[PDB]
UniProtKB/Swiss-Prot annotation, chain A:
Residues 76-115 are annotated as: Mediates dimerization. The gene is htpG. Molecular chaperone. Has ATPase activity. It comes from Escherichia coli (strain K12). Phosphorylated. This is Chaperone protein HtpG. The chain holds residues 511 to 624 of 624 of the full protein. Residues 44-115 are annotated as: C. It is found in: Cytoplasm; Cell inner membrane. It comes from the Bacteria.
Length: 115, 121
């Protein structure tokens, strides 16, 4: 199964993996639970000179999206990974407006753009 | 055997206008389609943060857009005759250069929509 296949891949890097029909052009979104470290709170710590507490995100994919459908249809393992990774960074970039490794994102993006 | 020809630069300049201080074609030591930079005696990215941190207000850094002539995607853009598609690739690359330089983009969602479409093209 797709969802399980993504959970396996991402392991604990994420709190959970769900499919949301919050239709739009967006293929993926990320969010935190009610009473857990929010991305907004995590930034407050950085802004106060403290190290950023871990944020367990919930990774949600749009099954109606062409890219998510594509991802799911990919048999190859490495390829299937490039997509999940690309979608996760995408959701993360939208959530926090920043990425841990911006260049890695740009690199994997362009790799799927030329292949 | 790297003599790059065409009017690609003029085309990109026309399109970007003053959103950029200038456009150039320079090679890279990586597989990066494009980067952004600042010349000497010019407010750089870090300088800008220092400025703001000092309680000052300053205009957004007008970067120098440097496209990588040997990169597939930069070539694809130059070959695209459709002003729409062209403009789309250029916008994608410029946004990639900013993200890599500033670690952030003014409109992340717009960038994300763009790559998504282009990934499906
Ligand atoms: Ni060359």
């Amino acid at each position: 199964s797709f969802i399980d296949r993504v959970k396996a891949l991402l392991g604990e890097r994420v709190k959970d993996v769900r499919l949301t029909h919050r239709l739009t052009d967006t293929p993926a979104i990320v969010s935190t639970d009610a009473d857990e470290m929010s991305t907004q709170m995590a930034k407050l710590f950085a802004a106060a000179g403290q190290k950023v507490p871990e944020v367990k995100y919930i990774f949600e994919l749009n099954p109606d999206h062409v890219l998510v459908k594509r991802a799911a249809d990919t048999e190859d393992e490495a390829k299937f990974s490039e997509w999940v990774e690309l979608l996760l960074d995408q959701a993360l970039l939208a959530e926090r407006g920043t990425l841990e490794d911006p260049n890695l994102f740009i690199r994997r993006m362009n790799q799927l753009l030329v292949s």
